[PDB]
Design a protein around this ligand. Structure first.
Ligand code: NAG
Length: 278
């Protein structure tokens, strides 16, 4: 029988970041399919991430949504989370290319523009929060595994963990919740609108991206949404994962995984439930 496979899309429109686009389209789609953008980490690739999170493609088969795997061949295969272009709405670079991949997909498959989501690990988690801050008009939910608060690397000469200024990855950058909220506002000056629901994950033993970044991400998004922790669930979804539920639970939740390092493995069902797809 025919089987869907990951395939590179060689022309998806304008590509300011000079990125690759790969797509997994199930053989049977929902009538108005959702789109999940799945973002690899540094030194990774679209094909690598397709293998790294093995439960995503079967979930697409079961639910009839489309997976878009962008790929970066620049800066140690890291996503640009440092330049003004990538960090800003309509600015350019990788984030605009990713949005163009989304628009290509919505147009070709008559997809549901209200059901575009993004998930990523490490560098890809960092980019997922860039997409949340700079393109909240495109994305309705994000799931960031082992990343860094939006804007931490603003101005940096690169976005990999090998640059000279490694203050963010080393956990040395602490800003107030208000400062992190104002950072998010800088992604789209004058925008006073919604932001996609944000789910963040980090491991307490991460030697690459300090778990201090989890605390900074919590400050950032609790300020954006104006929420505080209302409930904590132990061992949720797995032993040692502490789930922090903020407000009424509809905008921001966070998971700190005891003993886990770089990166927290993707919990597909937790992320799909967050996106409302299951
Ligand atoms: C956006 O919100 C700020 C307060 O955060 C306010 O000063 C500004 O007037 C608002 N923009 C518009 C167009 O109303």
């Amino acid at each position: 029988h025919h089987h869907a496979t990951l395939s590179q899309v060689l022309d998806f429109g304008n590509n300011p970041g000079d990125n690759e686009m790969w797509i997994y389209v199930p053989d049977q789609l929902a009538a108005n399919p959702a789109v999940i953008v799945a973002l690899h980490g540094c030194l990774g690739s679209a094909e690598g991430y397709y293998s790294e999170v093995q439960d995503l493609p079967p979930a697409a088969d079961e639910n009839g949504f489309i997976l878009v795997y962008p790929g970066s061949n620049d800066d140690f295969h890291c996503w640009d989370v440092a330049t003004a272009e990538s960090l800003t709405h309509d600015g350019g670079s990788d984030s605009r290319s990713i949005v163009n991949m989304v628009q290509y997909t919505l147009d070709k498959y008559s997809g549901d523009s209200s059901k575009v989501f993004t998930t990523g690990s490490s560098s890809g988690a960092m980019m997922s929060l860039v997409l949340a801050a700079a393109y909240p008009d495109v994305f309705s939910g994000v799931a960031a595994y082992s990343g860094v608060p939006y804007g931490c690397l603003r101005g940096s000469p690169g976005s990999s963990p090998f640059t000279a200024d490694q203050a963010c990855a080393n956990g040395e950058v602490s800003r107030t919740a208000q400062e992190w909220k104002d950072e998010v506002k800088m992604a789209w000056p004058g925008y006073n609108g919604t932001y996609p629901k944000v789910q963040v994950w980090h491991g307490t033993a991460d030697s690459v991206i300090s778990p201090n970044n989890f605390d900074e991400e919590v400050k950032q998004w609790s300020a954006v949404f104006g929420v505080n922790v209302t409930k904590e669930e132990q061992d949720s979804p797995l032993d040692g994962y502490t789930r922090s539920i903020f407000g009424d639970g509809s905008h921001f939740e966070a998971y700190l995984a005891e003993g886990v390092g770089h990166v927290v493995p993707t919990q597909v069902d937790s992320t799909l439930r967050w996106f409302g797809l299951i």
